[PDB]
C-alpha cells in the first residue's frame with residue numbers, strides 16, 4: 001500500500017521484543033519498505049485462502065499473543081533478505097528485489113510451513129509438535145531459500161534432487177541463524193519444535209541420525225513417502241555441509257573444516273551456477289568441487305575438504 005515508512009515494536013513467538021518496519025496509511029501495516037520492493041506480512045485468520053489480508057494494526061504496537069507469529073515472520077524475513085544481499089549480493093529471491101510475502105495463522109493446528117510457489121506460509125502448530133513456526137529464524141530462512149532455489153537451480157521436489165533442495169534450505173537456514181547470531185546451532189527448528197521437550201529439534205545437521213535421518217549414502221531411503229524422502233535423505237547432504245564447515249571424522253574419513261563463510265560461498269555458487277532441476281547427489285558433489293575450484297583454486301584446502309566431506313558420506 002501507499003504510505004509512509006514507520007517503525008513499530010512488538011513481541012515475537014518466544015517473548016522477545018523487537019522493532020519492525022511498518023507502513024502508515026490510516027492503519028499501520030506489516031509492510032517493510034526498507035528492503036527491496038518490500039516485505040509484506042498477511043493474516044490468514046486460521047483459514048487456508050491465501051494470502052489473506054495485509055496485516056493491519058491500529059497503534060503500531062504488536063504485543064498481543066495473536067501478533068507474535070506475524071512479528072517474527074516479518075522480522076526474520078528481513079534478516080534473511082539482509083543475509084542474501086550482504087553476503088551473496090543477491091537482491092531478494094529472484095535477484096531483482098521481488099516483493100517478499102508471508103502469511104501467518106494458516107489453517108488450524110497446522111504443523112508445517114511452506115513456500116507455495118509465490119509466498120511463504122506458516123502454520124501455528126498444534127502446541128505439541130510445533131508452536132507457531134515463524135518463531136524459528138532457521139525455519140523462516142529455510143522457507144525463503146525454497147524461493148531462491150526455485151528461481152535458480154530449480155531442483156525438482158522429489159528423490160535426490162528434492163533432498164538437495166531440502167538440504168539447501170537447511171544449510172542456508174542455518175547460515176542465516178548464524179548471521180543473526182542468537183543461540184546459533186546446526187540443528188533445524190529447535191526454537192519452535194516440541195515445547196514440552198527440551199534439547200531436541202526437527203533435524204540435526206551435525207548428527208542427522210539422532211532423529212533417524214541418514215548420514216551416509218548407503219543408508220538412503222528409496223521408498224515413495226515424503227516425495228521419495230526429501231526431508232529424510234537431506235541428512236546425507238546436511239552432514240556433508242556440516243563436515244565441510246566444522247570438520248570431523250565420520251565413518252573413519254577425516255575432513256578438515258573450512259568454516260561457515262566458505263561453506264556458504266561454495267554452496268551458493270553451486271546453487272546458482274551449476275545445479276540444475278535434475279541434479280543428483282553425485283552431480284552436487286561435482287558442482288561443489290567446481291565451485292570451490294573457481295573460488296579458491298584446484299590445489300586449495302577448500303577443494304580437498306569438499307572432496308573429503310562427500311567421501312565421508314559415501315557420495316562419489
Ligand SMILES: CC(C)C[C@H](NP(=O)(O)CNC(=O)OCc1ccccc1)C(=O)NCCC(C)(C)C
Pocket residue numbers: 111112113114115116117133138139142143146157188189202231
Ligand atoms: C524447517 C521446517 C520446520 C519446515 C519445513 N517445511 P517445507 O518448506 O520443507 C514443507 N514444504 C512442503 O512439503 O512442500 C510441498 C509443496 C510443494 C509445492 C507447493 C506447495 C507445497 C519442513 O521440514 N517440513 C517438514 C515437516 C515434517 C512433515 C517432517 C514434520
Ligand SMILES: [Ca+2]
Pocket residue numbers: 057058059060061062063
Ligand atoms: Ca496494536
Ligand SMILES: [Ca+2]
Pocket residue numbers: 177182183184185190191
Ligand atoms: Ca538456535
Ligand SMILES: [Ca+2]
Pocket residue numbers: 138174177184185186187188189190
Ligand atoms: Ca537452528
Ligand SMILES: [Ca+2]
Pocket residue numbers: 190193194195196197198199200201
Ligand atoms: Ca523441543
Ligand SMILES: [Zn+2]
Pocket residue numbers: 142146166169
Ligand atoms: Zn523445505
